[PDB]
């Protein structure tokens, strides 16, 4: 029978390479971090007609919905052969969960008179995430620091290891960073040092950097943001 895992992802514009999709990147990262053998098939145009292309076969069985695939992988790939990637702190699963939605409304808005509201809503969401990244978690200890630790030095959302929460959020933050810069000259504010520490830590991980689609894929996917504000 069909055995193993195949992840089907959106193809880029060349019809063969990885295209823009935060959901595909999320699953790519999970499978990488699991240490499981898998292949990635790009989709270039028993599964329903026109199902949206981030899906997976597991021993031949088709699995849909990015959230359900995550839950299935975390439940089927377990120690000792595969690590658990679930978070230890429940707040890690909700931190910044509105950021991508607010960015989407900001970047898709056409009316200039509404930009201040959408941009401020984005900044408010980012502030909340930055606060979580900079506030030490309760169990956090800096064993090597004689001084008191007021700004968290942990690498990622939940601690020093990448978890499912990072696989969800990091692809979205990567899109925001590329698109908002290209089309709005908008950047994560310099005072949000938690977001910037987090991104610097993440871009130093092969599992994040080498699952990012090319910048031009992401910029092309959002090419409608180059239109004038009416």
Residue numbers in the entry: 359 to 403, 412 to 596
Reproduce, without paraphrasing, sentences from the article in which this PDB structure was first reported.
The structure of mCLIC6 has been determined from two crystal forms at 1.8 Å (P 21) and 1.9 Å (C 1 2 1) resolution, respectively. Comparison of the relative chain conformations within the asymmetric unit yielded a root mean square deviation (r.m.s.d for all 226 Cα atoms) of 1.7 Å. However, overlaying the TRX or the α helical domains separately resulted in significantly superior alignments, with r.m.s.d of 0.6 Å and 0.5 Å, respectively, indicating an intrinsic inter-domain flexibility leading to structural plasticity. Examination of the structure using Adaptive Poisson-Boltzmann Solver (APBS) showed that while most of the surface electrostatic profile of mCLIC6 is negatively charged, the inter-domain cleft, formed mostly by the amino terminal half of helix α1 from the TRX domain, and helices α4 and α6 from the α helical domain side, demonstrates a positive surface potential. While this interface demonstrates highly hydrophobic surface properties, close inspection of its structure revealed a single inter-domain hydrogen bond, bridging the putative transmembrane region (PTM; helix α1), localized to the TRX domain (Q383), and the C-terminal end of helix α8 of the α domain (T577). Intriguingly, the structure reveals that R384 forms a salt bridge with E436 (2.87 ÅNH2-OE2), an additional cancer-associated position found in malignant melanoma, raising the possibility that disease-related perturbation of this interaction may contribute to an unresolved pathophysiological mechanism.
Hence, in order to gain molecular insights into the metamorphic nature of the canonical CLIC domain of mouse CLIC6, we purified and analyzed its conserved CLIC module (mCLIC6; residues 363–597). mCLIC6 was highly soluble in solution and crystallized using standard techniques.
